[PDB]
Design a protein around this ligand. Structure first.
Ligand code: UU8
Ligand code: UU8
Ligand code: PLP
Ligand code: PLP
Ligand code: MG
Lengths: 363, 361
């Protein structure tokens, strides 16, 4: 009956005892949580309950919950930034609401009003705003999560769900400290006709084995390969950019196209928009193979390779382990000039050093 | 290391729930009085196993089962025999598959015989839930989740293994199924986890299943590749009983090349077909074009799905490219489907002795 929850209906239960904030420079990504969380219950019978901001607490879930059996779940990732003017800003948060709604439809989780969820998120951040670090290299990570909670082993559209939001203060990185990539084509992240273009939990559970194999070989991320010609698709959890002289001898920033096996990153979209705006080199959404890359390296045609994502912004790549060899990528010996310029521009926008359509000041 | 059944801590319920009518059972909606839980940490390993009253789980909202689908499950049944002895059916094959699923999920390994003994003790305590009916059974749902309170993408350092029991009727609610065949959706890929019972394989498949039901179909016919290989009957393995291209009587099923879940029911059916030695048994690729060419030549006898929940699930129709393609399964007996169902149910309910059953602990 209640088609969507409304921020105007928020019930706020503040915590009695507030926790000590961590040192911004000693932060391990996603291990520290703020005082409060957002929860909103849904049922097929009654629709959306009123949204709650309350102290961070365990979830009480029926052990038959479809999130635990059939990965009926999705998540988002976005950040709050304390500006040089001390105003807290979100970055492109409507793109995260759009993507979460699209993910929910694909997961068969109940739809919600995107503007009402964003307002509830703003009110949660506002309450916990002293967690948004006083540092131009740290931020508050925002993790909207949406799970099936129906107490039934049936394989079907859930009749019960929980939408919740966690906040986690994070440093500039995770622990330019460049990443080594593990490339093993025996493992495939995502396929045409699959859900790799949605942020659904199921995409990541199936990717964990390759990630643990990467870390066992001293690599931080998996280079995700696709098809008989070994297309390079994603830098682990991040979109893939290659800055090089292409086959026609033109300076080019290249990234794989949104053909269904690529997560359409907010950071990816912003980087393409900046590169188009600058007009200093060719910008191509195009297929890239291991053979394209190794042929280019042998011709000294590669300048830079980096991943893009909310957590890293720009993540330079120095090495790829492939067929038993270490292939060096000369990113850090080429500046990295473009990676640095992109990171400078995005952080200038995020921390309010310049005005942008891409940021909103916290309500 | 492993938890040990000899260490079981049993907390019996003081208030029992009313048992349901065996003839009114909706699959997986009714749960018994007790559950099994076992905690693991990287720091200290496996804690002692607990049998205690069914309860909600208390999970940190950062638990990797909720964000990154760090989870797997199993499905097997307990049967009250015609002699009133409760039997499990091929449960060691479920333990083998659950162990393999755990390794692929990066969840901690455990001793398969210790888990089976703990499952036997749980069923024994809740044995009056095993229905008094030769067409009902007790569904057993071992489940294994990552519970580490961290958004890190990494091997979990905290996990919970639990087992739920659910009495179930005949079927879900021979009532043959109609299949929805749309090649725009792909269940599983080579280099993926489709050959393991990991939660992630199923969350991504729900959209197609809801589209199937909207078109009056009970299951999705999972198609793969440019040639539209027929792979799985929704949640079930796919069998085709036909005259093949060489004019030989043949039972065909897709091979285990990485996109097929290796079913216990599938294994039992191949074992029986090989034992009978009355026709060719082939693990081979089957395409929509193979099927339609065969139907036009009146070469198809039967198509059925196999799984713990259905045993043998006859297929009457496939909706494909806007046509209903009739499969003549129910006009051909279905003789093989019936023979298989008769044999497996005879073994499950102790109407004949078999190496495939264990009488309860
Ligand atoms: C109500 C009804 C009437 C007639 C035929 C089917 C019916 O319901 C369905 C049940 C299932 N279904 C489950 O609900 C659970 C399992 S399971 O728990 O045994 C299992 C889960 C995951 C993988 C393998 C088995 N396996 C299943 O097939 C399904 F997938 C689709 C439908 C539909 N429509
Ligand atoms: C410890 C360390 C040292 C140096 C570089 C990275 C390091 O940590 C890692 C972080 C991540 N990692 C996360 O843990 C979470 C997200 S996330 O929450 O932003 C995210 C998760 C899922 C999809 C998209 C983003 N994104 C990530 O890359 C990872 F996958 C692998 C490693 C490794 N090794
Ligand atoms: C989340 C994600 C990205 C990057 O998305 P952003 O919106 O830039 O944070 C890239 N690839 C994969 C696989 C992802 O899950
Ligand atoms: C579980 C499962 C089967 C059949 O497994 P059984 O062990 O026979 O119950 C078939 N296909 C898929 C996709 C499955 O998940
Ligand atoms: Mg509105």
């Amino acid at each position: 009956v209640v088609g969507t929850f409304k921020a105007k209906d928020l019930i706020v239960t503040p915590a009695t005892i507030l926790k000590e904030k961590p040192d911004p420079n000693n932060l391990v990504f996603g291990t520290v949580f703020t005082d409060h969380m957002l929860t909103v219950e849904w049922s097929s019978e009654f629709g959306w309950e009123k949204p709650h901001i309350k102290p961070l607490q365990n979830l009480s879930l029926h052990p038959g919950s479809s999130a635990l059996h059939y990965a009926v779940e999705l998540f988002e990732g976005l950040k709050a930034f304390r500006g040089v003017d001390n105003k807290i800003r979100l970055f492109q948060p409507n793109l995260n609401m759009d993507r979460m709604y699209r993910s929910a439809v694909r997961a068969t989780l109940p739809v919600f009003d995107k503007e009402e969820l964003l307002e509830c998120i703003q009110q949660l951040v506002k309450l916990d705003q002293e967690w948004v670090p006083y540092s131009t290299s740290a931020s508050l990570y925002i993790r909207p999560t949406f799970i099936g909670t129906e107490p039934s082993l049936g394989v079907k559209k859930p009749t019960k769900a929980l939408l919740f939001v966690l906040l986690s203060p994070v440093g500039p990185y995770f622990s330019f400290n460049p990443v080594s990539l593990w490339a093993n084509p025996k493992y495939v992240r995502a396929w045409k006709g699959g859900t790799g273009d949605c942020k659904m939990g199921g995409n990541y559970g199936s990717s964990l084995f390759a990630q643990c194999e990467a870390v066992d070989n001293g690599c931080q991320q998996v280079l995700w390969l696709y098809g008989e010609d070994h297309q390079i698709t994603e830098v682990g959890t991040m979109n893939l950019f290659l800055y090089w002289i292409n086959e026609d001898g033109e300076e080019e920033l290249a990234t794989p196209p949104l053909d269904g096996i690529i997560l359409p990153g907010v950071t990816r979209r912003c980087i393409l928009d900046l590169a188009h705006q600058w007009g200093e080199f060719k910008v191509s959404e195009r297929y890239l193979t291991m053979d394209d890359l190794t042929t280019a390296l042998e011709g000294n045609r590669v300048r830079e390779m980096f991943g893009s994502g909310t957590a890293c912004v720009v993540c330079p790549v120095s090495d790829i382990l492939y067929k038993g060899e270490t292939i060096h990528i000369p990113t850090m010996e080429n500046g990295p000039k473009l990676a640095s310029r992109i990171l400078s521009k995005l952080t200038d926008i995020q921390y309010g050093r310049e005005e942008r359509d891409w940021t909103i000041v916290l309500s």
